[PDB]
């Protein structure tokens with residue numbers, strides 16, 4: 564089990580002002596550290612956040628968090644469940660800031676809620692250095708859904724923080740699962756508008772090079788993987804279903820006739836196109852919401868290679884390899900044309 568630690572700097576808070584924190588299981592024989600960002604949507608104004616506080620309070624507050632959690636999938640310590648990194652130091656960071664991990668704003672006389680996701684990540688890293696992170700050779704920042712977008716927004720800032728603090732030997736890398744979205748046209752008739760409003764409500768921050776390209780008022784562009792990815796310096800592995808259920812939901816897709824058939828086929832082709840220049844990627848032709856912390860994450864394969872294998876090949880590449888591929892994108896055009904898709 565992973566054990567809860569509330570942050571020692573109690574001014575780094577969840578939405579309601581309670582302390583943020585992390586769950587930790589140390590592995591003293593290992594120099595690998597996996598830090599995983601939870602997902603779970605976001606909220607973007609007072610009324611929308613008030614609703615979330617009524618029925619999704621664990622995503623806004625630490626007051627009711629349990630003392631332990633079990634690691635599953637890529638967070639499992641059992642070799643049979645996690646062929647990739649079963650011996651690593653494991654960290655699960657709960658998502659309690661409702662800001663896609665981008666905020667840097669405290670509760671105040673003018674602010675009902677605090678949005679501190681970007682500061683939570685920095686403070687977890689700083690407190691872990693005294694618990695063994697100072698001896699790491701690799702820090703993998705991973706996450707699913709809003710946490711996967713959070714990886715894209717924060718991996719280079721973690722790298723720069725460790726450099727400025729005096730730890731140049733730690734190699735920082737990212738793993739973004741189910742956080743790679745398209746700002747496309749809906750099938751029936753606003754996510755880009757909600758993100759734009761959220762950034763202003765949260766005092767949200769984006770990576771520096773991407774901010775300088777798009778400039779003031781246009782920082783919402785940096786929440787879209789295909790636009791922010793080319794600006795990043797740290798190595799990033801991208802995992803994305805070609806027919807992701809969250810993408811189809813915001814596109815208003817729920818005996819399929821010609822117009823919808825063409826829409827779905829075009830969505831898969833567009834997603835595949837955005838990954839052409841992403842050398843480390845895993846993108847199966849499936850309709851799914853399933854994520855990399857699920858216990859059966861080993862079962863899906865693209866071109867005969869599982870995700871745990873592809874991640875191992877990626878590690879080797881950062882020391883093309885014969886029989887050890889890292890770029891795995893399905894080419895078949897309809898959900899479940901890959902026989903290994905989750906049932």
Ligand SMILES: CCCCC(=O)N(Cc1ccc(-c2ccccc2-c2nn[nH]n2)cc1)[C@H](C(=O)O)C(C)C
Nearest residue numbers: 603604708709712744745746754808809812813852
């Ligand atoms: C063009 C941007 C696409 C990304 C996007 O709009 N997002 C928010 C969201 C919220 C709620 C739902 C949702 C609503 C009702 C019912 C089911 C779902 C759902 N959620 N997952 N599957 N279905 C979908 C997306 C991302 C996410 O959090 O996914 C963030 C990171 C920007």
Ligand SMILES: *[C@@H]1O[C@H](CO)[C@@H](O)[C@H](O)[C@H]1NC(C)=O
Nearest residue numbers: 572573574575669679682686
């Ligand atoms: C605690 O966190 C706050 C908010 O990020 C920061 O301003 C402050 O300097 C921190 N205090 C210490 C002692 O690290």
